[PDB]
Ligand binder design. Sequence first.
Ligand SMILES: [Mg+2]
Ligand SMILES: [Mg+2]
Ligand SMILES: [Mg+2]
Ligand SMILES: [Mg+2]
Ligand SMILES: [Mg+2]
Ligand SMILES: [Mg+2]
Ligand SMILES: [Mg+2]
Ligand SMILES: [Mg+2]
Ligand SMILES: [Mg+2]
Ligand SMILES: [Mg+2]
Ligand SMILES: [Mg+2]
Ligand SMILES: [Mg+2]
Ligand SMILES: [Mg+2]
Lengths: 135, 131, 80, 156, 199
Amino acid sequence: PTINQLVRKPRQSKIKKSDSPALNKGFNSKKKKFTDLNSPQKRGVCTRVGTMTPKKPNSALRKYARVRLSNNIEINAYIPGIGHNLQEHSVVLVRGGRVKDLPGVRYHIVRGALDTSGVDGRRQGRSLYGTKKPK
Amino acid sequence: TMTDPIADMLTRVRNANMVRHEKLELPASNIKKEIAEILKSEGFIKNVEYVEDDKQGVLRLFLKYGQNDERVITGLKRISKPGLRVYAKASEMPKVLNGLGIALVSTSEGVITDKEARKRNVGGEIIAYVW
Amino acid sequence: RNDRKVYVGKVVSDKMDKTITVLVETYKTHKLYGKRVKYSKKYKTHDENNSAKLGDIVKIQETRPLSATKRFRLVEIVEE
Amino acid sequence: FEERVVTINRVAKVVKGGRRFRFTALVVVGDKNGRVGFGTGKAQEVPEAIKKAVEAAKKDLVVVPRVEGTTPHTITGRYGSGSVFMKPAAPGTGVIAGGPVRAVLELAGITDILSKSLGSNTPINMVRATIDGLQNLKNAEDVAKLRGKTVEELYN
Amino acid sequence: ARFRGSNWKKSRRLGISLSGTGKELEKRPYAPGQHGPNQRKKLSEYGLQLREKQKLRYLYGMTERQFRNTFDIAGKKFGVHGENFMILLASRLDAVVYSLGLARTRRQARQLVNHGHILVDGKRVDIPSYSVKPGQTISVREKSQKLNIIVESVEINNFVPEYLNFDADSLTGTFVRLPERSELPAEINEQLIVEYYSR
RNA sequence: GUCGAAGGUGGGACAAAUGAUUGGGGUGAAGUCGUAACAAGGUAGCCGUAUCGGAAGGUGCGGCUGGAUCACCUCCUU
RNA sequence: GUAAACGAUGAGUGCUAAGUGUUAGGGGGCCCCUUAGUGCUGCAGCUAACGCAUUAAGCACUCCGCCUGGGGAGUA
RNA sequence: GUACCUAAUCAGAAAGCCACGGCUAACUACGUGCCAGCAGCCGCGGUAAUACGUAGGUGGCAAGCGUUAUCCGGAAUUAUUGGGCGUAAAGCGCGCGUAGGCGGUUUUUUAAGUCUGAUGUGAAAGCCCACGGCUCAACCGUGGAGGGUCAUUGGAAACUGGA
RNA sequence: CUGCAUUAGCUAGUUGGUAAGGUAACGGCUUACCAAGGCAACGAUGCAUAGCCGACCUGAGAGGGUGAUCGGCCACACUGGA
Ligand SMILES: [Mg+2]
Ligand SMILES: [Mg+2]
Ligand SMILES: [Mg+2]
Ligand SMILES: [Mg+2]
Ligand SMILES: [Mg+2]
Ligand SMILES: [Mg+2]
Ligand SMILES: [Mg+2]
Ligand SMILES: [Mg+2]
Ligand SMILES: [Mg+2]
Ligand SMILES: [Mg+2]
Ligand SMILES: [Mg+2]
Ligand SMILES: [Mg+2]
Ligand SMILES: [Mg+2]
């Protein structure tokens, strides 16, 4: 563009979207409204727990939970590790990070936080799965 | 229509230099003549002739080529333009090619080179770069 | 001792009684692209005798508030 | 002459049955004293591809004007969509460059410079852009001779 | 020291005698581990820069954070960044004590200064990170003037660089001037480390 | 007595949530029907418009070459 | 009030090798020169390449319109 | 009765986290067998898995190490610096024309822009440079430098603007 | 010193004058009278969001992001008026 054109209409940068929108929102119950606040994690209650089939070419029964967060937004959160002790009404902590195989699963359930138990028999990379040091 | 005679002159010089022409005739003006004189003094061109005819006169530049037919003028760039004019201070005068080139400037003390602008401690409108 | 700001500008309306609006013209530079762009500011100045007329280039000086939006007084008519 | 293999690439030509694979090697050769060149070689194996590339690079060499281990002035070398900006630095800066540009500069013997690949990052065109810049570099003595003056007159 | 590990394995990994004797490399000059022998892979450019940085860091027995901070402060000095970094590493009280020879090993000198057997200008200094400067003197605590380790190291007459002027009778060293690149170890290419911290 | 917060009454404006029901959109596994496009894709394709048909699409009018092609004439370039 | 409304190429301006047709003119001796169009071939230069190349997609200046991954969608 | 100092006793109480297919430093054995599971992108796993889990070893860090969230960078990916619009996204289907932007040559004049000098101010703390004090450092302190599109005032007239 | 035109008209004490009252103070600050003025595509009005700055983070820079701790200025003290 000409300099005159830039003066008339300045350049406009692309707007960036978050990969974890559900974590950017809190809820005020008194005013019954949403608020913009960045959280690293949010608490939620497992509305459902079960398995999902990944999209091709992968094949599996991937463990996940449908969770209603403290801000009333319902999301799908993957359950990492081998074996879990989660059921409906379990209170879980949810962090960002989607599962590429799973289309609508955009968050992870932290292991070893709130109700969720650490992975049993895990010994390498334990902090990632909430397993205490065996010693 | 025509909007920048200085840009037209610089582009004439650039095109002639590319085609390796020996001489170049263009319509004249005082600013163009001063630019040509600066180029000659600095050694980028060979000779400058003014033809005081009717219709504002003519400038006849003679370009300079070194041994091996190497071009003395590597490039000319219009800096200040009608669409956006550029000025610099004496302490902010730019060096073309780390000093190996000249910046033709227009100052209250006449159109001079960046070296003279720095020496006299003056700024002005940076007309062009030549290297 | 201390002097007050003085401006020069054209008269763009005088329908008000004893008040003329003076358009002072300036050129603010674009902060990023650096181009020179026109900038007009209208000044409401006191014209006691209605001497100034629409069009003439006049001179104004800053004063204390004289009305809701009048802060200047006509000093002289530079041209007409 | 030191030699550095910039990239090795397995290319394929399709035939009535299967494919014919070859190895292409891009190599830079330099004496670390102001002479640098690059070459490409194609062969059925990478050692032979490298050998052919080195021979071509030695055939094609350029002289890089320098000033105490850095270039005389800022330059942008361009080839196709390749584009490399290069700027003289001060001693102890190091060579601030990435990819094939660092190979070209180090083998040319430059030890202090700043650079930025502004264009395509395909290695052969990056190398060609860098070589174009180094070829278009100029030195004070040569420009003074071309303009019919002295270095002192040039710098005023 | 802070890194209490197999200095022989570190020397074997980095292909350098951190002690300076060469004993580690004499028998097995290849890297430790199951794949140590018959190891023939070629390091990348990043690998080479990292190896140079690790060589210098483990030579001076420092942690990564302190090493990086020292490099940063050296960069602010006038001159060549790499040379300034090397001389600044040399100026550390650990290095000065080891060069003076009050201990046979750099880690031993570090433990001496940490436990306070050393005095700078006649005052205790417990911090091996202390950056010595020209014109200062390093002495030994009177209560520890007759330590077996220190006396044995003094008896073993090691070379004393030019920038240090030592007298074993008084166990008194002097930091005369700043070192030079030639005096400082030549097995390190400081430009590689400068580039490593460039990226 | 003037001014005057709150309040009341009224018709409008704007925003959000929610609503029987409804519309297309996206994704998804070997689903069902056909085969429109890519070769002249077996009716060259595509564009605007109109209308028809389960569906892709067909058909009409004008336009484009970003169309293959055997014979013919008409020119231009080397 | 829309089309592949196309040269898929905004308008104005100047400058930068050549060869050869054709439309409507002009000047000097079938030839030469010349103005404005309309074609083909082709340097320098440009280009990712194809190609463009005095009818630029080269070199420059002024102003306007427009673009910023594919779908969703020219939809709500 | 804290900092700090002195005297005695003991290596004895005081190392964990992540990673090791490429990017990217670090590889082997078992178990599993498109399952369990991993995954930032490309992808990995169906019997020879350096990619899943464990083990040995190795790499990076270390009283911290990883994950998530958010911002700048890399991104010249809104391009003034510093990009484009024949075929990649991009020239309105085409006129006529308003505001605005821009504008041929010379002479005289003005000083709005433009250039230059002086004065005041731009608090302190902060950043940067130097020095000094905590054993070092962080930190603290003291000087210097910086930061205005700032204002007042005096000068120049080439270019842009006005006459 | 901020975003939006899928916000284009806004304003009637409103803009100016006269007189008086009122205030520490000038002033449509308020009232009475006369006039029809005032703002706006150089973005008025409307809507949304926001305490501002010294500074802080990042970037080679130009720029981009932020406005904790500490200092300055402002505003508020269950909500509204006095
Ligand atoms: Mg070749
Ligand atoms: Mg078909
Ligand atoms: Mg068909
Ligand atoms: Mg039909
Ligand atoms: Mg259309
Ligand atoms: Mg079109
Ligand atoms: Mg023609
Ligand atoms: Mg950017
Ligand atoms: Mg297109
Ligand atoms: Mg068109
Ligand atoms: Mg201050
Ligand atoms: Mg608020
Ligand atoms: Mg940048």
